[PDB]
Design a protein around this motif. Structure first.
Motif, PDB file in Angstrom:
ATOM      1  N   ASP A 198      -4.622 -19.862 -15.828  1.00  0.00           N
ATOM      2  CA  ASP A 198      -5.317 -18.601 -15.607  1.00  0.00           C
ATOM      3  C   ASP A 198      -4.532 -17.435 -16.195  1.00  0.00           C
ATOM      4  OD1 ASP A 198      -3.244 -18.877 -13.849  1.00  0.00           O
ATOM      5  OD2 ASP A 198      -4.457 -18.702 -12.027  1.00  0.00           O
TER       6      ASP A 198
ATOM      7  N   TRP B 148     -14.402 -11.382 -14.958  1.00  0.00           N
ATOM      8  CA  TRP B 148     -13.043 -11.824 -14.677  1.00  0.00           C
ATOM      9  C   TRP B 148     -12.564 -11.338 -13.317  1.00  0.00           C
ATOM     10  CZ3 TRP B 148      -8.311  -9.759 -13.640  1.00  0.00           C
ATOM     11  CH2 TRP B 148      -7.200 -10.576 -13.845  1.00  0.00           C
TER      12      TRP B 148
ATOM     13  N   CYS C 299     -14.489 -11.058 -10.441  1.00  0.00           N
ATOM     14  CA  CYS C 299     -15.088 -11.710  -9.283  1.00  0.00           C
ATOM     15  C   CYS C 299     -14.392 -13.025  -8.965  1.00  0.00           C
ATOM     16  CB  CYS C 299     -16.577 -11.939  -9.521  1.00  0.00           C
ATOM     17  SG  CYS C 299     -17.515 -10.429  -9.793  1.00  0.00           S
ATOM     18  N   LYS C 300     -14.277 -13.909  -9.955  1.00  0.00           N
ATOM     19  CA  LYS C 300     -13.643 -15.197  -9.728  1.00  0.00           C
ATOM     20  C   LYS C 300     -12.151 -15.078  -9.466  1.00  0.00           C
ATOM     21  CE  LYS C 300     -12.471 -16.361 -14.471  1.00  0.00           C
ATOM     22  NZ  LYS C 300     -13.085 -15.221 -15.203  1.00  0.00           N
ATOM     23  N   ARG C 301     -11.578 -13.886  -9.604  1.00  0.00           N
ATOM     24  CA  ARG C 301     -10.198 -13.632  -9.218  1.00  0.00           C
ATOM     25  C   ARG C 301     -10.078 -13.090  -7.804  1.00  0.00           C
ATOM     26  NH1 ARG C 301      -5.102 -12.982 -11.589  1.00  0.00           N
ATOM     27  NH2 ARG C 301      -5.945 -14.337 -13.226  1.00  0.00           N
TER      28      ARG C 301
ATOM     29  N   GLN D 272     -12.238 -13.773  -5.480  1.00  0.00           N
ATOM     30  CA  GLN D 272     -12.537 -14.932  -4.652  1.00  0.00           C
ATOM     31  C   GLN D 272     -11.523 -16.053  -4.804  1.00  0.00           C
ATOM     32  OE1 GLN D 272     -16.441 -16.027  -5.883  1.00  0.00           O
ATOM     33  NE2 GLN D 272     -17.247 -13.945  -5.678  1.00  0.00           N
ATOM     34  N   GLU D 273     -10.642 -15.994  -5.802  1.00  0.00           N
ATOM     35  CA  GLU D 273      -9.525 -16.929  -5.826  1.00  0.00           C
ATOM     36  C   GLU D 273      -8.431 -16.495  -4.866  1.00  0.00           C
ATOM     37  OE1 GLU D 273      -6.963 -16.502  -9.008  1.00  0.00           O
ATOM     38  OE2 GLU D 273      -5.601 -18.094  -8.376  1.00  0.00           O
TER      39      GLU D 273
END
Lengths: 432, 432, 432, 432
Positions: free
Chosen positions: B1, B388, B390-392, B394-395
């Protein structure tokens, strides 16, 4: 000036008296630290207001330095007739004042009765009793913040609307052609009423002090332009001073039962609404088991009785021991009456000293005291209706200001919440 | 990532990059202290409100825990048509929403134009464009305190009257029979709009978060009765958190030039209105003398360009280096484009981590996360229009909540300041 | 007294210069607030010491008002020979001073070498070089608290034993019959050395100031008896003043890289160890891209070069632009050399103004300035070895003290850490 | 578990009792806020120590989180003989302990006598009484800071030298070959003595609590490495907790007469040296005028008498009213004896509840309570010599820890200041 004992006092009671008097003793070394803290707090409040003149942030300054939005002060040369509304607690009055061009006020009536829909008919009711058919003042001693001189909001006790137009529309709903034009505080009205009724051969007034069932102050700040103030007169919220006070344990207990806890600690030591409880508690402590059953009640002694005890000159204090019986159903002997006198003389003396060191601080923030001369108008229920308390306040004020005591004059003003609002509504309108 | 380097980088520039990346590094050990401080601050704010629900005292809690005065939340079963007014800065819109009994909203138009006497004709102007001749919502993003759901005062920018009835009387002066009934915040409307358009087989929503040109949050406090709150939904002023933040020196300089100084230090690290300046300053520091003349201007880079740089997949980053030229008139080489990517990836990652640790704190104050399941509606200009980010978010949210990540659902809500105020005005009235 | 431009300057560089000069501007209105805050802090520190003279509690007063335990000051009439030890960082000296009865000191050597077991042989080594075979002073500039004049503890850098007897037993282990009798600070020694070498027709000295690679002060407090102090001289920890300082953003960044963070914020604005970095950063900001590669290094400019730039009178500033090349390998043009001069003249002027407003505060706490006359001994690396900085300090000191400037005399003292400790060890012993 | 009234009580006295009982009432809703504040304070103290492990800064954390510099705890498998010195106030003891390899201690004598030159002959005097001619412990309950386990400084009561070597050189001046090797606190010795004498089939001990004429705590912090601590055991200065305490007005007055003013407010509510005064004051308030003349003295009632009143089961409380006469020379009637019992039962119950909520906080900072099991060793004059106080502490501790009460075991340890220092001096030396 101090009480003298001649009667033989027991050893235990004398020890207790001596121990509880030194808890109320104010020496001339602490008064200087008090004056310094007060002046510093004033300056810090001014700066903090300049930084954000909208919200009051505690831990920046104890004084929320409010501002009356007045333009300029009167001189005693106007004319007309004006009406004022007072509104405190349960029942309060309405005032009508006539103003000639010679520095004299004429007042008519203060009607009391036990709800904005009632006051318009009240004003018409007092007006018909003079039937000489403009602008009306307003005091409104309640929690309110005033962005402008005409309007003020309500945040406590429709409970939240504009308390100015609320009163204004009641005159339109009725026939009365009278509009609200000022919402003043209890002390700025005192300042103005003192300024009007001075004369012509007197120095200008710069401080307005209220010492009664509540303590407050307002003063003329010459540097009002350097900061963001619009009025020449600043309202100190003097009762909230809490920097370093000489608190006895009785003041620590009487504050815990306050319902206003941890707020206004300077007002609870000097104001007339709290001296009776102080002297009651001290009397319970000094007369340990000999105390009656009524001396343990809460409101069993108010300051009107301390005034009676202080101003006593009879051979046998038949008035000072007649105020004991009807309050505490007890036949006081000689040692006990001596203790009572010695306790009241200490409590009221501490109040007078601390209230005299708060006038020197204001008179020192204004740097005029060095050369020029000016006056202060002191009003309240402790100043009036008490003789031992005036010549003591002015004795301490003559020792705090060592070489300058002759530059500052004391002029007792009267009826601030009345004549004050009327004169303010007259000045804001005739000179509009 | 993480970004990977293959091109040979100079030693000096590599040293500078490595030195300035570790100033933006957020390890999983600091995030726990952050969560703990946040939860403690929430609890302290609740208690401090219970002690005096009128004035906000800083140094008691950074969060001024406001309260929407709503009665109850919707379920997606009402019906009607309702209109809403948005009013932020220079030009903003008016909304009309139709509501059926199936959890679906239908919207018509958002008209913009460049003064309370204009908005009534604006509402009549949008209404005539539908000519189906009640109650209107209101957002009014300005400094205001709301004692009740219907009214709110104005203390900043007639500048001081009632901003509710001000709008109300314009409908009476005109023909329009529409009255204001709610003045909601940007986040409570988000909460309601998310609750309505959920469905039927989804957990209940409890947190409404706004991450955009400003950051804020509102949440459902189940213990609202134990304290003096009238609404089930509490508005955290989340942007003002200042307990212990990992501030780099760039954040110390960008705050000195703020015109909002020493206020809202948590908003200036995570919101979309400030990330462009952060990355601009960091780029000036890492490209010491090679920087262009435009890289020293103030507003030469905003977050819409960081979004373009982050979401780039071309073989040669011809879009990431086309956003450089038109902003900083400079032909970037390979090392410089690598530095730019590595700087944006750090700034936005810190923002996402700190904004994910503020949702875990709210979800931890509500003690439901242990057993039950619920949802959160996240809205804003950073969440939408950025993949980039959103999926961070929620990570990080899946690592902060170690074993409970499956209990909390994320449901992207849309258009809070619109549909939100309409749905609130519909609920407060149909269920009145 | 201000720099004048004649060469035509570009518009952009002129705008930048004008913008960055007004960030260092100290007007005569802020200096008064500074003096008031300083005086108040002094008084609060004295009181807080009286309340608990053992531990230093921050948030009570920034000044940890230490006390030298001296008995009385010298007059310049003693006699003898005495030895002193200085110990700062890596390599420091040993002093031998002969004292006649006429107010004159004779000194021999200051030997430097690169560990208590070494200093006794060092003292024997300097003594054999005079072979006139008592009591030895000691400065020991390290973190230490001194309950008494003879002993002091060590809490930082056997690392924790008694640093007095540690030195004392090394004389017993050897033949040397010399004992430690005083552990003085850098400023009280300055005070004493100034008091000795005055003369007979000069006012008494009351303040000892050190302005160099560090800033500190000590003064004679006449009210030392009212509080719990044993010595007539009080050591202010002047460098830690943090009440309200005019901090630019450069001061906000240079403090973040300090390794002494959030401590001593007044020392980092006025001391000679930090002015070079300030002017370096400001030069980087004003010469945005034209700056060289060496202007981005950390220690690329120290105050000895600012002294060279300030004291320049050549037709073409061939010395002010020769100090540029060897430091920043760059051939400065005319606009750039003008900018450099205008930046140094601002930084050093702010330092001088703030250091002159801290002497007026001390001279105002002592209420003697109204009528009597007294003197102050100023020592340091900024006062000496700089001519533009003396006539500027004494220009600001002549405007802060409006009508009293003639009552306070400035007498440059020399070598405090040397002659000072010797004279203190002589006074504490000959008059024991 | 509550006192029940059957005798007819007057209305006034019943009203007073009911009013003064609700001032000491601790509900299970406040205990949770207490636990949360305690845990937060612990964490803040740890961090603040990591930031500067040398000076204690109040307003950062009330707990000055000291550190014993011990290496590791014992297991009950060592052997030898070791001697310990206790030194509190006027007259205290010397201990000799023999240690076998089975978890058992054998003690000989505690000699008391009414000055470092006396203790060496004291140790030789006790040693000759066993004549089996190493290392000696030391408790030294005085104001001291310990940079290392061997040495500690003295800052209060030669008054300032090293209190470790002071004792050490007295053994060299004499024949005694015994050296000091540890200066422990009263609670870490309790922890060690509990750990030794446990057995083999018991969970490990992690908290050592002292509840007596003083309250303190020490605990095992597993994260000791992440911060700068050298010992696995941390000494909380538990008595100084002042975040939010339920203070009655009696606690506000009893603190004003303390000679330790505004310090240690948590110790003055729960410790055995202050409960007698609390109950005396409350009795004076509830029996207003019926109180005797001795009930107004200061030390007329200590906690040993409250212990007698609590543990009373006679038909007629002839012991509870025999402790009245000899203390307050007064023949109590039935209503008065009921009032006395109801007041003691409230004061001691509040103490027990607040001391049980401070063990749950420590057991919650260690996150082991969720799954594993461990023990706590409680020692003191309130725990021992009182039966009503143990089964009440452990009743509150069984309700604070709702589902985890079975994971935490209570093991009453004995004689911490004795066996503790001996075992510590044995462990630090045999395993050196």
């Amino acid at each position: 000036d101090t009480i003298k004992c001649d009667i033989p006092i027991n050893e235990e009671l004398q020890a207790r008296i001596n121990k509880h008097v030194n808890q109320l003793r104010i020496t001339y070394s602490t008064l200087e630290e008090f004056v310094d803290n007060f002046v510093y707090e004033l300056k810090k409040g001014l700066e903090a207001h300049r930084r954000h003149p909208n919200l009051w942030i505690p831990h920046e300054c104890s004084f929320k330095m409010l501002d009356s939005c007045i333009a300029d002060i009167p001189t005693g040369q106007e004319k007309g007739t004006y009406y004022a509304i007072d509104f405190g607690g349960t029942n309060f009055r309405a005032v009508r004042a006539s103003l000639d061009g010679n520095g004299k006020i004429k007042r008519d009536q203060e009607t009391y009765s036990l709800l904005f829909d009632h006051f318009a008919e009240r004003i018409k009711y007092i007006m018909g009793e003079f039937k000489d058919l403009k602008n009306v003042g307003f005091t409104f001693s309640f929690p309110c913040t005033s962005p402008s001189i005409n309007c003020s909001i309500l945040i406590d006790w429709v409970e939240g609307r504009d308390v100015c137009k609320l009163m204004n529309d009641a005159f339109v709903r009725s026939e009365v052609p009278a509009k609200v034009c000022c919402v003043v505080n209890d002390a700025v009205g005192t300042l103005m009423s003192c300024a009007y009724q001075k004369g012509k051969t007197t120095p200008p007034c710069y401080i307005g002090i209220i010492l009664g069932t509540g303590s407050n102050g307002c003063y003329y700040e010459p540097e009002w332009k350097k900061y963001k103030y619009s009025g020449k007169i600043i309202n100190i919220e003097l009762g909230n001073f809490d920097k370093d006070l000489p608190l006895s344990p009785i003041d620590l207990v009487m504050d815990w039962h306050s319902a206003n806890r941890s707020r206004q600690l300077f007002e609870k030591m000097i104001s007339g609404a709290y001296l009776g409880e102080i002297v009651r508690r001290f009397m319970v402590n000094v007369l340990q088991s000999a105390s009656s059953e009524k001396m343990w009640k809460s409101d069993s002694f108010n300051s009107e009785l301390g005034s009676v005890v202080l101003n006593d000159t009879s051979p046998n204090f038949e008035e000072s021991r007649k105020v004991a019986k009807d309050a505490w159903d007890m036949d006081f002997t000689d040692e006990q009456i001596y203790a009572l006198r010695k306790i009241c003389e200490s409590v009221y003396n501490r109040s007078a000293a601390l209230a005299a060191a708060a006038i020197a601080a204001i008179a020192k923030r204004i740097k005029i005291i060095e050369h020029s001369k000016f006056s202060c108008g002191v009003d309240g229920s402790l100043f009036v209706k008490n003789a031992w308390y005036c010549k003591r306040l002015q004795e301490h004020l003559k020792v705090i200001l060592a070489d300058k005591a002759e530059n500052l004059i004391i002029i007792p003003a009267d009826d601030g919440s009345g004549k004050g609002a009327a004169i303010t509504a007259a000045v804001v309108s005739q000179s509009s």
